[model samples]
Target: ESADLRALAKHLYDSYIKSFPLTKAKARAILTGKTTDKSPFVIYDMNSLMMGEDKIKFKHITPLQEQSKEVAIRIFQGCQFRSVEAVQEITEYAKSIPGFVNLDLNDQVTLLKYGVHEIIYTMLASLMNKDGVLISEGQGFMTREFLKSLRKPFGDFMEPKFEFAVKFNALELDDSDLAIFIAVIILSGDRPGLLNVKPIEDIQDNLLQALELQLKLNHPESSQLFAKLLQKMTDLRQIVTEHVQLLQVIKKTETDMSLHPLLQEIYKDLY
Candidate 1:
């Protein structure tokens, strides 16, 4: 039974990851830990299902779009969020949840990003583990309250570890590393914009800042905050490991395009 749940969760997580924009870049950043910062976009996906508390409707409508011809001519366009009001409705509720205020700006971004991503993945994984195929709207939307309620019973199952960050403008970031970054940001409440991630010393200094903040925030919800943060880290670690395994499986089926000679040569000279 538990194995089924795990499979379901993994499936849901993978699907959500595949569906999201710039996910490949996000994953690359997680795997390589080398990135140039780009404009960050809020993740706004998922919707409520009919008469279901744990089920949802998978609507792939997002409004974040970019049209570029000057560059390599990549275009990202979709019906995201529909309008600011919808985003506000979802985000406002999330922000209103207790312990959310204690989160730092970077963590705030990541929590929203990962929260939605994980929930979708979890649900889908559950469905697939039982049904043996992707099932849309197989379950109901798991609301904030639902997630909060599950912390005690299923909290250990949801630990997260990935942190997304900006090395410099227009650079991509690593997901797991970025997960650590956001975890530090939320736990420690330090300014990330000022630091450079190239040196070990710089990374250590910022990490200490996060620890300091975690120790200092004597809020009533500190325990909850800690649980939520740690679980995210654990979950992120699992996610990274799973992605690596998936890469291995795919490599077995066909040529690994990411490992092509030209691609490897380009990365070999990376500075």
Candidate 2:
């Protein structure tokens, strides 16, 4: 029963780690406050910026106006890269799930459009601590303190996500559990523009069943974990909605800032 699902989840988890090996290295750096030169940390390349020169404090907002703009744009672009890559990675992985590739191309696009941000944020939560996410290849972490220091609208846009991430991390799920959890989040049928709701629902239900069975074995003492994970799906929707709203404000107020087109399209669906 769950053995098969567990194997599949493990396979996906291994594949994901293979794609982003730096994530594990950053996690190690988080455990012990250090980073090696070779690590290619995904969030921000603080070391790359310094290049064995003068020390640079990892502040989310630079003090000077022009410098602040540059920093904010660079960080936003970094965030854009993370989200876009997540969408691509998950899109590729979805094809491996039985029956997923058989779905219409339009439906596939619709699922990715509505679901990518939520999954991206969910995955980010895995790397999060109460402090913040790993940054600059684990050399530094980005915290709520730094996020609040960011320029007006940009700061406003980022703070809620950190708040949500801290709460999500309290569940203390390991990567294997997260693989199934994310699978359920992505295959949801309730996304706004689904052309084939029944098939989507069927697939999600199968995943949920497998997850329930697997959780019972993996976390035997935590009777509530399955329900809590399901609740997270709802919480993720609310959090992402707030993010979309803030992005709308940013688009209107920050005329000079460039938002990546894929992100722009994702926000468009929300509004």
Candidate 3:
């Protein structure tokens, strides 16, 4: 079990190395929200919509609206594209984890459908902090003040996540720890409509054991850190629930601001 645990940990690291969008240094800069050889957090003055190939920045562009509403739509849509894309990335990660693919195929999809947002928010932990998030892979920045200034439903959407990430990042989690934790989220038995609960219950139990072992190895003195991380999982669920609630409002209020097709499908069933 210990030998396989080590391999699982390495597999997690290698999986993220291939799946992640940015380099170690770049992700580190964003994670710390600090200088990367130079100053960070160069706010993109909502005026300068640089027409570069920021896939996350310009994933899909449909121009014109109530101006500020359009701007907020653009920001939200950009992030949504990344969130949808994360479903795919997390699925790939799932396939690599033991027993994940062995469950009902429907269960596989169900787990990801529920867990994807949490994965994206964890990705946000890398891309953001309390102050703001990096946009277009750090080519731009979105300050929290600007985020809070947007119109209702859409406004204050990410504040909860930002607050979550601030504390999550404080744990100084590395790639391997995040990978195992995300695996825990995916394999959770508590997710609605799971077909084979014990299978995942078993999987989650083992993952938690693996996580505890890692925490001990990583933070020997931080004795309560394992419990703290478990609290984080509970907190993660609440944040995603809040995420879905705002998305429902966005679905109702922003007729002009359409969600990505994949995200729309997720929301169609989510609400």
Candidate 4:
């Protein structure tokens, strides 16, 4: 019966990745390298207020817009937390699954390093809202308009990810589905430089089967949901492709701007 599968899925999800630490101060620090004592921090209210008004003066709006843009980029950076602890937790979570730890260490590291961003974005997409995503565990939020209004390359870089997220949310898959799907993402054999594709693919197939069966039991109303979710996986890869491309450009041209060491390593051999 599918009962065993559901229980196992629940265990995998609940054992790691809680939602409480997503606070505005924490998020801001992660994003901007600063913190504030303010509660329910604001990211983009001024733009929402004045953008549609007729007599908005540039002088009045410019600073807020600039701050807003900075906030957006910082928030995105905060969202893409590649800290050693976070990465290790994800790797540990993957290893928790049966047979995942048994894979060659090289393969494990390959999948974790390459797939980490994709997995992080996948989890972030689950937390998305119509306006934007909640920051600091719903205590604070970043607005869609503000993110769109971010200036230049930084603003444009994450557009594909948010777009894909908005579309993916329409399917309304629950946490269990997300858990299995994340497993599928981590176990993917298609990552470049995987030392052993066969075992990875086997794990992926097992994950996909469990995910499919779970969907069948959990969401019998729609026959196409499974295919659509699979499509979202491909969409995620495209979004990551754009993300990596942006990182490449930034690293090449913006040498003065510091890139996080962990992020630097992620992009180093991103073949």
Model 3 lDDT at residue 122:
73
Q: Note the residue pairs that clash in candidate 3.
A: none
Query: What's the C-alpha lDDT at position 63 in model 2?
Result: 25
lDDT of 3 by residue, 47-83 (tens): 4443332333424443322134466686786676667
List the candidate 4 regions with Cα displacement exceeding 4 Å. Answer: 1-4, 16-40, 45-86, 252-255
Would you list the rank order by TM-score, best first?
3, 2, 4, 1
Query: lDDT: which candidate is best?
Result: 3
CA deviation > 4 Å runs, candidate 2: 22-29, 32-68, 136-139
Q: Which has the greatest TM-score?
A: 3
lDDT of 1 by residue, 114-215 (tens): 333233332222222111211112211232232223223232222221111111111222232232233233232232332322332343344444433432
Give lDDT: candidate 1, residue 106: 53
- Rank the candidate models, highest lDDT first: 3, 2, 4, 1
RMSD of each: 18.9, 5.3, 4.0, 8.3
Clashes (candidate 3)? 0
Q: What C-alpha lDDT, on a 0 to 100 scale, does residue 110 get in candidate 4?
A: 86
- lDDT per model, in order? 0.31, 0.67, 0.73, 0.66
Between candidates 1 and 2, the TM-score winner: 2
What tens digits encode model 2's per-residue C-alpha lDDT throughout 90-168? 7766666556777877777777788777887887766666656665434445655665666787777667777877777
Please, what is the TM-score per model? Answer: 0.25, 0.81, 0.85, 0.76
